[model samples]
Target chain A: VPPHGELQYLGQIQHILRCGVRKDDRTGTGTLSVFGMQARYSLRDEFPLLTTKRVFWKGVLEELLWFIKGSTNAKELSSKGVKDLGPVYGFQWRHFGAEYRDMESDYSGQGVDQLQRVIDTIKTNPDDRRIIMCAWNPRDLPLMALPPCHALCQFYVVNSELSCQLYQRSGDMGLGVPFNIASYALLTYMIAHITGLKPGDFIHTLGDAHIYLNHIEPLKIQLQREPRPFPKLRILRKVEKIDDFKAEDFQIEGYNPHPTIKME
Target chain B: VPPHGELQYLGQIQHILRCGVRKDDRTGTGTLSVFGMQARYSLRDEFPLLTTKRVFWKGVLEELLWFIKGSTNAKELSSKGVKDLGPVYGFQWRHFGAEYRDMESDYSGQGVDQLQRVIDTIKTNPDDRRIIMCAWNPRDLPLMALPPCHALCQFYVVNSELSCQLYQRSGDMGLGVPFNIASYALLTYMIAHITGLKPGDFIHTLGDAHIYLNHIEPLKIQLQREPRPFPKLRILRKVEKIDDFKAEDFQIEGYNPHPTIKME
Candidate 1:
């Protein structure tokens, strides 16, 4: 149960399909959702990439690296030659300090450096429970293409090990959630590596956890496949700074899954 | 399960007691803690007041009203002749905009009114999932006597019914959690009454769910008591606004608990 955490993720999808209430969302796609849920991955055993389906490991790494740089503008991301996923996770991670006026107003760079602060806390006072990074900004909500779904997260240190818990307000179970789990798990591993601490657990807490109406069949196909062994996440280089790690630094071995299930 | 949410609450205590790791906290009290957990209560079916032990109903009501008033200063709370519980919930709830200098600094009045905005959203855009009220201001962390534990919450609307989910970063199981559940449940009910919607679920998500080292004996005694039927929460008047309702306007009936177990 501690190793893959894919079983828990699968259980959540099954639970939602069986008992969830149907509701129309901002995307106009109806979803079957349950209010609250939580899942934990003990990173001490193995990395928590889902063995049931092929997760895009590169995309997850690239997005997280962009966030660590604290670059908000999607223009910068495109300039870096990556798909500009808009001003989302990375935007809030580094620059959640700006006085957001409206949708059109230019908040070039004006927010607290939450990433830098959390890293500093891990170094200075590892036991402090207040090591938090929040992407849910009330002032910036209207301006964002999609307000942060992976909203806020807190880091905890116990017995010289670091654990992270994410509070995601909305989770698209079939598509976004698998990547979310893997990305955050890798994030915990990266932070632990940089800060000289062992990776503990990646705790994911969700608000409106749902599976889209179109995603049900593909997910059912996903459930039939047996879970395989979790892979080992190896950071090839000693990346002392949290932000310095490039996409090439990370390597995952033994992550053989059944196949990718595509859903819109 | 819908009536009390006590079965879920009891299961949490038992889980922590069985598998929790002991950790030394800032207070030096030491705690048996687990990282992440969640519980849900259907407010449409019943109120989620703890039936095993007497929960202080008056204190819960008073604190909620103080937040609606958006008063950061405890002077107003003390002047109203209730207990001034320092700069905790109410301060963060109402005036979360001010630069929280420290405990001694005179923060006469300066902060955003989060309560008013949420009320406006509930009335106008009831389907909006972004109706959030947050008390976890990273800027204000050092100023408070203690940082917020029940940090942030999100409100959701489905089928003309309002539901709320709280992200509490820390919880004290024996004492604080029961009050937290009741207070938040009442908040959802009151908001629903004013916004022309029915009350729905009250979702509780926790981070460092823990029990104090000294609270073990008292909790064991508490678990032995059988769960009684949950009391019904009645708002005595048609309170048109979120701020208009006072402590006197609310009533709870059929609440017969075993007895108070003093852990401290």
Candidate 2:
């Protein structure tokens, strides 16, 4: 069985980052040049990513189901034994230490109901521009072990087909880009799934889609290796709705990455 | 004519800055609380604002067009005599001074073209995630005269419709809100216009979308004043694509705000 289709997605991301653009950074180190290409592919083919190497099928699936559950906190992630991305969406969305504390208080950053709210608004009011919620609270910037990968996101609907998008203000070309794509695409898929809509599109807008200073060569060698065919993304059960998904609902049947290329 | 639309969008963003949100010294004094809103009443319904308090409509229009042009530095803004919120989207996407005066050494930020790349990719690949670009650059943060207003932004395509989403990581609910809404919606409209798509939705995802503490009474008075049915928005002329836009091409015909509220 083909074990790693998702790796292709990962590969393409690295391919572009390594070869696409050379990015300048804030650090004293000169610019972290890149070669990345941002292109849209067809989700209609099946689930977005098919794992290739030691596919953490459980980790990927559960993390997705967790986000679909519309959580932004890591506590839930830890309990379910989800791998540590640790920085949850809500941590950035609801409160950024400086402004919002409790949902009821004066500065409770906008909440998750925002996702459903936008969906509902689109169904009812197609013209509301305030349908977006951002999770990068500068006030809370110091609190995060890592800032959000998918920093900002928004959606649009036409003819009942719900297409959602994510803007990764900054994307790490090597490690996070692949999972970021899978996760947001997964988020879009679920949002579309529950809203009684076909998945229209998944947009990933990025600012700095670059390889880290430390991850260039190893990532490049791995990229040169051929990617296996995409694995079959197996959902353990049919999700009648987006929110109906749980960690138990998914499985990655096949995924094989070239030898794990360790970043320098 | 009702500007260019039969529909207009209205939204508000409020943020709560929990204490000690920033590790560095807090540079801005918006609010422990922030609040802001924008109404896209059709130009046909009402002219944008400035009915009561004196507002620089020319400045508003000029600035809006500046963002549409995607010029980041204060260069054009200062030239056009429209400089208020410092360098924004343009600066982040273009020469953001990331490495401090290093534009010649591959240090300039990405431009709107990066955003366009995402759109083109989506058109060719459906399963591929859509494209969205942002102006907030971490490396550029220190270089920015003022922190970015709409700190993070994302764009997406669904069902052939294009939309942009923004995450205002920290917002002053009062002062910046109106422009935040109008500017992005207009930017979206312009972007969708050029991208062979229609403007779909604008989501005001907020980390902190709140009003300043000092502005409470004004908000109370402003809110008490009815938002008169919405005004209409109109694109002066139809252009086949986004990049083809000229400043004169946009015209707001109808917009009525209860006497202009004074900013403290």
Candidate 3:
């Protein structure tokens, strides 16, 4: 059987293309938005990265590593050769800055370490229902370069397997959604690898799953192509700490996909 | 047309009872939990108070008002004849208690007014995608009597109609899920009413949709009943502020649901 994991990603594109309603969004380019969609991928069998269109893994790796390290400054990511995302994901992941007195000052010390606590909960109390990492800090919205799209994520463990669920308040299906799927799936792999558990599933839930007007043609091309064999996320060595692993430590094997589909 | 909205709710019950895997939960009450499920209800068409089984509107209304008022103390809820829920929903909605040094001491002013900000955004810039109210403050987990089950919610405006989406990290399917639906649906109506926009859709996204083992038979009984026409949520008077509407000001008209199904 062609792996069931990637089909979930492809099915969302198909569903939105077929039945979504046209809606104007904050971005000047309008979109076809179908609210409330979910897809589950069993990370034990295959990684959930989309094979219909090539997804860049560098962003996923570096961004994830930066988040685990609890650094809010975008400059930290630039040193790792990844484009600084301008304190979008990792900032909210680590330094939420809720108690910051002013906008322009360094307020990294005042926030909570959600990822660290999440890891601690998974190791100590895996059954805890509140193992959540939230990026939608309402207080810090004006300070951020952009508010979070992939906002809230929660992890669950059962029978020695870890599963993650992400709530993306809004998703740009053609561009951001594919990379989001891969990034979280890799996060699950890395977390599971360290927590002494097998990967279970990554349940991606969306609020406004949309295809921007400009990216319609690129997505249509993506829909036409058949998916290839799924790739495996290989962690080369056992790392004692979450921060110990670098970009070179992770490898994608057997990911031969149709050429990249460009979108703005 | 079976009202595509209620079918989304009823279908989840049917789907879980039929196919959900048996799992253990933190409550010591085992559950048959399916990972991710989504339901959407158009408040313009009908209120999403359950028709297959009766849902208590009182709890839905009072709890929501308590949340909007930003009161952390359960005594305020107790004074209003609503059961003191022990810092459940409203506490997180208002006093998030992020900066408090200890759980035993008073920490009233440390939180954000998510409900107020949401109302302001709906009125000022409805198009803003960042209109979110979050309850999952990881810092205050130890302070909370019960960490939020219905964790985070985000609002959206398109075509001059307001919509809400909630991410409930875990739901007690038989008892809590029905109330959760009604509570949020009513919250949407109140917010939409004051915002000068028609109520659009209230989307409920569940991470762990479960049926507690003890309540399985009553839910199966619930599943057998034919769904009746949904009720109308009527606000008796237009209030200037979100917190001004009391339980008496809100009325449910034309609700003729099936007999109440009991769950322990």
Candidate 4:
């Protein structure tokens, strides 16, 4: 019965532990939420990266190559000493509307890269529907340190494949919804492996899908196991710039998981 | 099994007439699309509008009182002569980050009203996880005349019930998805009746979700009729602001349906 897509993230943690709603948040530590939710994994032929647990795959490939190198400097992805993560999600994905001056300023083309215009509109308008990217900059959310809970993302292409959609306005379903679904399914497989396409579906969408009333008995013991088959993202080279990939090129083929259930 | 939510908008027009995907947009008149999708209507005790067809409830109450009077002036919601809808979605919800002149230049307290900060954060932080409202202003999308196919919206609250999630990057499942689902479920019952609460759940979410291969046989004859049961939004005054909503203070009550199938 469970073919995969991690059973829609374990049926959204058993539908927020059976009909959530017990709110009170912003870290006063209390929630069992559930507002709007959606889940769609399948990066076509594998890699949704969560065979039920073990997901930090090198902090999701060094925070998506530090948000495609637009680094708003979390001390360049971990000293954990936190250094200006201001405009957040890699300063709104490569400087959205510029003008924020801190984390060692120098935003090349000063704002609006929108992740290289979603990889040049998926290689020249792959049926473009405003191939979006936004990190909820309500005027840079009072210069964020933490504001964007996986804010906005959109990118879709048709037959050639592509697909991605994230609109997380708050999700902490047991320690950050499996690292926001393996960091937007590894940023839709590194923009469908440098725009040649073929990665399809990541989806995710949630508005307040909680569950931190002390991680609901470790997400019901990690939703009673069983969900293995899903690991294969081997990029390794020939990546023509979504900021010239790194974090040792990339590779994760056949990852066996289901163990790490330490939710604090 | 029709128990209305208008059968999830008639099962997304029968799952985009059976598994979408033909593409070719920017109005070349070809789409069968499907990207991400979520639905969920139930504004608690009725008012999802479409009982399986008949939806234009007076242009969804005069285009939601011309987007709660933040009006980017489409000649105040229709003369069809079109008078600029540039900074769309009520100028990104009452002047986000301001400075957009010439629509008769007044913009009261200039930008960032965000629907009066989402009715003062659902009346003083309804557990605020950033009650967002964005109209996808990637630096005002080259002065939009149409780039907000219901772009970004979020507002939740919990037991007292408010709920509303929108996201829409594009959706026209037969002529603008039933007027974008009764204009965001009548703007979530006018912000849960001017923020006292209890309207709950509109959800919607979608990325492409198309259908216009000439409105697919009038959305498969309005998805084979039968749905009828969801109408009771009678605010009839007691408004107390959210731009003192008008369109005759509203009222729809028990609306029967099964008629309008005239797509274009």
Candidate 5:
């Protein structure tokens, strides 16, 4: 059989370890980095949660729900181990172009709801080339806790299937990337479910794909593990709207994997 | 010998022809489309001005110069056969977040000069992940002649070399992609020149990578021809500033390509 989609992530990690340039980073930790890398994961019949190592499936779902809710407050996502992350992904997704006040301010219909607009466009005009939701607002950068790493995503529809491409400005190849992949793939699945289209593919494009010096050993251990078959994501009930998705509605089936490797 | 970088472009054309889905597009023309694609072209010793087919090098240089000057007025690029294009790439690149009146309005420091900021970031904080220039302003989309296809680009600097990654939301593989490749590669070359860094790689990531159905036969024919070695771009004079470079100062040497295939 051919290599599973998980190998793409593994290959990238291996590539960075072998050939990436040593560079100093914002965190004061050094990194072995490559500039550009892309990996495609099929959302057809299988969820691309990594099989080489277990992924935090619940955190992925909850964080995505929080983003859909457009709540910039990290309080809403306290279970995810964050607090008061100012006006980041969720805020920019829901209230782009609106004057952002504080986390408590009511932004009901105040700004462009890019997520809603994207769904509407996918339904009304699937051929429209502008179905994009962006999180990297230049004006809102100063207000954000950290600038968006997964900056922008564009959706495409062809033959009753919906696909998404994410342009991430930076990625932590060992720690953050696995979660990023699962999160976006789950997002695509939810949107496709509500929009009445089959999930096609999730394309993750990254700039400054880096493995921190600390992550190198853990990633090498991960590279040695063989990939198992991807799990199937079963939505427990029909999701009618993008905003209506709940954490319990998502269930990952048949997710057998190797032991998890921990890295900070 | 390893395959030339031009083969990546050729391989995409072949992939699209073989497995791309049939889809209707905004142009009322049909397309053989793939959702996500990425191609990396090195800008090291040679410029990647597609030797598969002769790309218009002059137009690429002129239009880039026009964008660097922040000229929204297409009149400045009249030699490239366009008129008063609305607030497009140039306007968004220079005057993003500013109010727009018309193409002729003076926008001197009116909004965020993302180009200058990118350069400054490269010089001052080369490790900064936020060195991005985006043309996909959702608020300003209504004023644009057309939404930006080549939308967001992020610059990465490592080991004294600068690399650029462009997230193009849509691409016309046969007709427009060649020029787009040369354009961004040239932009990378210019920025690297001014910032005292070597040009590394121009990574083009696309959302809706498609070939017009009408252009299929021509592309198939074009694909049959082997790729020639890419040409070298030489700066005639040492340029200190990004804006100081002129059309005459740049030269392309030994760019021998296959005969052009015209597509509408």
Candidate 6:
């Protein structure tokens, strides 16, 4: 995304944070919705994730690791000293129970290590049947304080580059876009390291990746501003280990901007 | 859907099934890809799913239950007395896994009970996050004897009704549509019952819900056939208890017939 678009997204997320508006039930209560939008960008042009925004890089790295590890607990995140995205995957897998009658077990609160299981399994077996980790539990809604931001993300190794596709039930584009892309791409990159694959494209498929109703005017305002040249993304190459990775591992170049915009 | 629509769907499915032109990746050789098309229907006015063919209601129901069960193991399907789709989900989710990820962590094989969890969470907590399941794992591609006929599905809730939104990333309108819609809508109904939410809407979002590239003539022929009166769906009584629902719980009435058009 160009600086103008970037600014809109950054502004939207920041705006939601400021408004403290957590959208729920598209029953018309929301004034602004940060709908998730998906597009394909050739890597030759730019990596869609942003560098200008003050993203919690450690959180991004940690979330990627968390997905890889498939560990949904706060302990892993806390131990990693990365950004705590509050409760995400763990609550769904662990807390949310299913209604199936003939089930051997409930996957609620399944360890987040499932992500790693996929990577490791691919290396040795390359054919274990059950490689999926699902986050959409119906029983745990009452237990959750806040819903998972991005519901499900699957990784694929295409042409030796780790590719990730996220099936987001609902994307709050303004507030969730930046973090979502960062987390997914970062996850893809990390998975590549373990699986010996290069990073492939991030396929973001959205159900309702729409703009929060309230942010339309601001989005228009941002749209009015001409998009600047693409910004180069930076990921600290020094840290090879997923666990040892930190926020500093990522960097950006040519991110010239005058000021941040307000959103929501 | 009316009998006419069902015939169309059934005809297309059969046509494509016989047209085996695409290489069979599982067999390590090309086979008739004609059988691979998935036809999906959304019938506000007609039996969209069956609009083009004869719907195998029994098989559709069995498959619907199977997916929510997340049992990639064909044993579970055979145990339940279901035929045709015995191991499709298992083959894709557990065995073949989603082509987008490492082979070890197949999102498809997570569990059958887990499907229920996704339903409950969406209904009770419409805003609760983390509701995603994937059938494609790139790394596990080589293991599966057959790739998933139908790809991925997502669910959402508005108010007290459980609404489902399915994403069949690569759908074949001719072969897969009839069973796809029945299976999905049935799943939606089941989830709604357990969530204490009424059945709301079924949003089948297809990335490429198309006929085979060679099926254009038949599609055009089918389109020429007159669409008859829409059908009224009857939900089974036992299905009131979402978890206690059965295939017989639902019935469709008021369908007319037309000739099956051929497609490549």
The DockQ scores of all candidates, in the order shown, are 0.34, 0.03, 0.33, 0.26, 0.54, 0.11
* lDDT value, candidate 2, whole model: 0.49
Model 3 C-alpha lDDT per residue in residues A1-264, reported as the tens digit of each score: 045577777788888888877887864878888777788877876777788887888888888888776555577777777783344555556555444343245645556666666788898888777787766544445654333334778888877889999888788888888899999899889889889999998888887889888887788778778778778888889986777878889988888878877888
lDDT tens per residue, model 4, A30-125: 888888999888787788888777877888678777877877767677763222756667776777766778888888878677778778767887
Better structure of 4 and 5 per DockQ: 5
Q: Which candidate should be chosen as best, given TM-score against the real structure?
A: 5
lDDT minimum window of 10 residues, candidate 6 chain B: B29-38
**Per-chain TM-score (chain B), model 1:** 0.87
Q: Select the stronger candidate by TM-score from 1 and 6.
A: 1
Candidate 2 lDDT over B132-203, as tens digits, reads 455553443563232222454555554455545565544555566555656766666666666666666565
Which regions of candidate 1 deviate over 4 angstroms?
Answer: A1-4, A72-87, A98-111, A136-150, B1-4, B72-88, B98-111, B137-150
Q: What stretches of model 5 exceed 4 Å from their correct place? A: A79-83, A137-140, A143-150, B79-83, B136-140, B143-150
Q: What is the lDDT of candidate 1?
A: 0.78
B1-264 per-residue lDDT for model 5 (tens digits): 067999999999999999999988876688999989999999989999987677777778888889888777666689555325666777877777687788778878687777888898898889988888777644446643323334778999987899998888789998889999999999999999999999999999898999998899999898888888888999999999887888889999999998877887
Two-chain DockQ for model 4: 0.26
How many residue-pair clashes does candidate 5 contain?
A: 0
By summed lDDT, which 10 consecutive residues of candidate 1 chain B come out lowest?
Answer: B141-150
lDDT of 6 by residue, A1-264 (tens): 033335544454445445433455435446332223344332332455554434454576666656444344566677877633333554333323222322233444343444545576557543222333445433344544322334555444323444455667666665566578766666666556556666656666565545566655654555445445555555647554555655566665665543454554
What is the lDDT, from 0 to 100, of the residue A244 in candidate 1? 82
Output candidate 3 Cα RMSD.
5.2
To one decimal place, how large is model 2's interface RMSD in Å? 15.6
Per-candidate iRMSD: 4.5, 15.6, 4.4, 9.3, 4.1, 9.0
Please provide, for model 1 over B1-264, each residue's C-alpha lDDT reduced to its tens digit, 9 standing for 90 to 100: 024468889889988899888977766598998888888888885788898888878778887787776555677666665673345656656555565445455544566556666788778776566777776544446543223334777898878888999888788887889999999999989988998889998989888889998998888778778899888988889988787898889889888887877867
Looking at model 5, the pairs that clash are none
- Model 4 lDDT tens row, B1-264: 036677877887788789987988875678888899999887877877776677777876787677677767677677622226567667767776576666778878776777778788789888887777766544436643223224767888888888888877888877777787788778878888888888888888889988888778877877777886777888878887888777777888888887776777
TM of each candidate vs. truth: 0.88, 0.44, 0.85, 0.32, 0.93, 0.56
Query: On residues A1-264, what C-alpha lDDT tens digit does candidate 2 reach at each position?
Result: 033434545655555554554434444332253222233433443555523323344566577666545454466666777642333454333223233343233433333344555556666654333345455534334532222334556665544555555655556656666666667666666666566666655555554456665766666555556656555444456566555677655555455545554433
